[PDB]
Each structure stands twice: as structure tokens, then as C-alpha cells.
Amino acid sequence: YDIVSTNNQLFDGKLVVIPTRAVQQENDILSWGQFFYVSTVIADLPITRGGHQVTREIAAIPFNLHVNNIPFALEFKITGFQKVMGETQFNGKLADLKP
């Protein structure tokens, strides 16, 4: 296995395991997915948007697609780190058994 991390909030409480080819190759199918990229276009034209003002608009237009290959995943929702490492687990429970 291998470990890769992101900081996107959409995984704040998620771990997902996905297989991939141990050695990656260009435009392979055995990769879990592919990112098909085309050069991004940047254009500059003094458009008069609105009909009453003139602005130079420099715009970047993405042109790409994310494609999945392997219909396989395991999804885990891992929560409660602070409740275990911050607090007691063994002696805290024994302390509750006092008559």
C-alpha cells in the first residue's frame, strides 16, 4: 500500500482505499482513474461587456476531463481521535466501578 494526503474539506472525515498499478504508465487503464488534460487557453480582448463600459478581460478556459477506470473502493469514516488519545480508556473505566 501507499499513503497520499490532501487537505480538502470533503475528506475531513473520510479514508478511501483505491487500487492502482504499482508502477504508473502514461495513459494506462490499470490506474484507478485518469486526468485527460488539454492546454489551457488564455485570451485577451477589450470586450465592452454591458454595452456601456470597456474592460480588458484576460480569461483562462480549462479543457480537461476526469475519468475513472476501476469500479473498486473501500470507504471508511474515521472519527473520534481526541476521545481516545486525549482521555483515559483503561483506568478511567475502572474508576467507574466504585460501590
Partner 1 sequence: SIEDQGTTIHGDVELVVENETSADVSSVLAEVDQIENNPVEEVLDADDAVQPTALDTEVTIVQAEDELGLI
Partner 2 sequence: NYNEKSQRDFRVVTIGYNLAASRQDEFAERIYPTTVI
Partner 3 sequence: TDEGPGEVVKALTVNTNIRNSNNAVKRMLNYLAQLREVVHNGYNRPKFGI
Q: Does 39 bind partner 1 (CB under 8 A)?
A: yes
Out of 18, 41, 55, 88, which residue is the one contacting partner 1 (CB under 8 A)? Answer: 41
In this complex, which beta carbon is closest to partner 2, that of residue 37 or of residue 76?
Answer: 37
- The verdict on 45 binding partner 1 (CB under 8 A) reads yes
Q: Which long-range contacts (CB under 8 A, 24 or more apart) does 12-15 make?
A: 13/77, 13/78, 13/79, 14/75, 14/76, 14/77, 14/78, 15/75, 15/76, 15/77, 15/78
> In the range 56-85, which residues lie near partner 3 by CB under 8 A?
58-60, 62, 64, 66, 68, 71-73, 75
Query: 58 Cβ partners below 8 Å, 6+ apart?
Result: 42, 43, 44
The Cα–Cα gap between 41 and 60 comes to 6
Tell which one of 4, 16, 29, 58 touches partner 1 (CB under 8 A).
58
Contacts to partner 3 by CB under 8 A = 6, 8, 10-11, 16, 33, 35, 37, 40, 42, 58-60, 62, 64, 66, 68, 71-73, 75
